[PDB]
Amino acid sequence: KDKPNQLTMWVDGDKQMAFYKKITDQYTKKTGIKVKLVNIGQNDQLENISLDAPAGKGPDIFFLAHDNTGSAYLQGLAAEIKLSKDELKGFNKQALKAMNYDNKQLALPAIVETTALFYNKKLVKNAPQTLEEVEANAAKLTDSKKKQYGMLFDAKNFYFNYPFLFGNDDYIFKKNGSEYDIHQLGLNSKHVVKNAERLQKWYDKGYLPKAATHDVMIGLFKEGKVGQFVTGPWNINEYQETFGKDLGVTTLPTDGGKPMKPFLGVRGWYLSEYSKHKYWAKDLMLYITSKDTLQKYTDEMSEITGRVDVKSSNPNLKVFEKQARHAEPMPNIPEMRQVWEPMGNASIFISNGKNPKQALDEATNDITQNIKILHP
């Protein structure tokens, strides 16, 4: 626990690098440890650290999307972070799980992301509480003529249709706590099929258009033609600009049970196994993931963070803060990469009238087969 002269961190982008410079300048004034910052996109940090780490010219702490947690660990790049309860206090419990593999905490969440339900108050006056209300608004507002839709979401994309397909008991890979069994898939369970048949019914009834893509849906919502729209927080400022006080945002509704859980995507800091100063590297991660820091972060970037004690002053983003506390992390294991395309294909097929059970069965067999190939 004897201080180094410098700690190096890899930051994702010029915007964030400017933000963390300010933050780390203060870290230096407090500890007297200089901090070198290096701008390296998160889509390139694993591959780079894979090379630079062994050469001794790697970072102490680096930044990745949580989907990579398993790979970073299996490769011997990401080191376990031992934390106290007081250190964990304040963090989103689920974001932490998203960064927990092989029963080890491997990162601290900085940014979180989920969808939520936007609504145009000129068409839907009250925030829908149940999926039945959402459907009911669909039945009322959807009209061939006006090119108006009661509800929308990119149902061909598994990322967006997940909460509509999977409730509490359902799963992608069977969970044994915070770990996943890769040989036990739940994509074609009685209940997912049943929900998939419901999805098919919405297409049949004209609620979801087969021709539109997520980008088209964004455009239609902005034209004031869409009552309700499940999507991410990415275009929030342009919806505010367009709708002002007529922009409603609420968490996803209940679906016959607990509130629906969308996927949770987390990005945060990992500790290099090749750090020669793990103790202080951690001291730095903790400083940069503090209430004080991430609060300044949310204010200045308009993104939801990995802390439940950080609060956006934007009431629309406050809804996403809540949503982020009731969400399911995208499985953080290498094998998950094999699920996206087949389920996507399944979804496309359902949209086109294919028997949903067959579609989910096909996807399941294909995922099983593909995992056996790329993950012997």
Q: What is the DSSP string of 300-335?
A: HH---BSBTT---S-HHHHHHHHHTTS-EE---SGG
Burial of residue 235 (number of CB atoms within 10 Å: 0-12, 13-18, 19+): middle
d(CA 156, CA 348) in angstroms, rounded, equals 5
Tokens of 161: 């249709």
Q: What's the rounded Cα separation, in Å, for the pair 374 and 257? A: 37
Contacts for 61 with CB less than 8 Å, ≥ 6 apart: 7, 8, 9, 10, 269, 270, 271, 272, 275, 281, 284, 285
Helix (H, G, I), strand (E, B) or coil at 41: coil
| Structural determination approach | X-ray
Q: Is the domain covering 115-262+332-376 a CATH 3.40.50.300 domain?
A: no
Q: Which residue has the tokens 């200089």?
A: 34
Residue 177 DSSP symbol:
S
Is 318 exposed, middle or buried, given 0-12, 13-18 or 19+ CB atoms closer than 10 A?
middle
3-state SS, residue 263 = strand
CA Rg value for the chain = 22
Are 151 and 160 spatial neighbours (Cβ–Cβ below 8 Å)?
A: no
3 state DSSP class of 152: strand
* Range(s) of the chain covered by CATH 3.40.190.10: 1-114+263-331, 115-262+332-376
Q: Measuring CA to CA, which residue among 124, 4, 132, 121 is closest to residue 60?
A: 4
Question: 99 with 106: CB under 8 angstroms?
Answer: yes
Please give the structure tokens belonging to residue 296: 């300044």
Do 165 and 189 form a contact (C-beta atoms < 8 A)? no
Closest CA to 271 of 98, 41, 49, 120: 49
Q: How far is CA 271 from the centre of its chain?
A: 21
CA distance 69 to 330: 11
Max Cα–Cα distance, the chain, nearest Å:
72
CA pair distance 255, 261, nearest whole angstrom: 10
CB 110 within 8 A of CB 294: yes
Q: Give resolution in angstroms.
A: 2.6
The CATH number of 1-114+263-331 is 3.40.190.10
**What is the residue-wise DSSP string for 83-110?**
--HHHHTTB-HHHHHHTEETTEE-EEEE
Centre a 10 Å sphere on the Cβ of residue 266 and count the other Cβ atoms it contains: 30
